[PDB]
A paper describes a structure:
In the present study, we deepen the structural features of CrTRXh1, providing the 3D structures of both the reduced form and variants in which catalytic cysteines were mutated. While the subsequent catalytic steps underlying TRX-dependent protein deglutathionylation and denitrosylation are yet undefined, the reduction of protein disulfides implies the formation of a mixed-disulfide bond between the CysN and a Cys on target protein. Following the formation of the TRX-target complex, the C-terminal active site Cys (CysC) of TRX performs a second nucleophilic attack on the TRX-target mixed-disulfide, yielding a reduced target and oxidized TRX. Whereas the role of the conserved Lys residue is still unclear, the Asp residue was suggested to be involved in the deprotonation of active site CysC in both E. coli TRX and Chlamydomonas reinhardtii (CrTRXh1).
Thioredoxins (TRXs) are small oxidoreductases that contribute, in most living organisms, to the control of cellular redox homeostasis. Indeed, they reduce disulfide bonds on numerous proteins involved in several processes, including antioxidant defense mechanisms, photosynthetic carbon metabolism, and protein folding. In addition, TRXs have been suggested to control two additional Cys-based post-translational modifications, namely S-glutathionylation and S-nitrosylation, by catalyzing the reduction of glutathione-mixed disulfides (–SSGs) and S-nitrosothiols (–SNOs), respectively. The redox activity of TRXs relies on the presence of two Cys residues in the conserved Trp-Cys-(Gly/Pro)-Pro-Cys (WC(G/P)PC) active site motif.
Residue numbers in the entry: 1 to 111
The structure:
């Protein structure tokens, strides 16, 4: 899926956040579920932005079915939910399938 990194475990989740802190590059995470309509509708844009901003922003995907513990720790309630992580901690979020809002989120934290 474009440049998006599929997170398959808590261990991979921690390592990616640790690398993003090392490299001083922001991380945008898409918390998804295959039963969620809005999640499937904005996934193509998340993939496109992952290609456009490759080198500036790290893009992760967390399926709440595959890694329930990471979704629980993140406090997810609705989907799609986007989280921005800087230096290991959550710095921003965006809930909903708004296309303009997602483009603005990635642009805000890539500058």
């Amino acid at each position: 899926g474009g440049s998006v990194i599929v997170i398959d475990s808590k261990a991979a989740w921690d390592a990616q956040l640790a690398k993003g802190k090392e490299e001083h590059k922001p991380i945008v995470v898409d918390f998804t579920a295959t039963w969620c309509g809005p999640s499937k509708m904005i996934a193509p844009l998340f993939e496109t932005l992952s290609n456009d901003y490759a080198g500036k922003v790290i893009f992760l995907k967390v399926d709440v079915d595959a890694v329930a513990a990471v979704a629980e720790a993140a406090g997810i309630t609705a989907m799609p939910t986007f989280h921005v992580y800087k230096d290991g901690v959550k710095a921003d979020d965006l809930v909903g399938a708004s296309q303009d809002k997602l483009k603005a989120l990635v642009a805000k934290h890539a500058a």
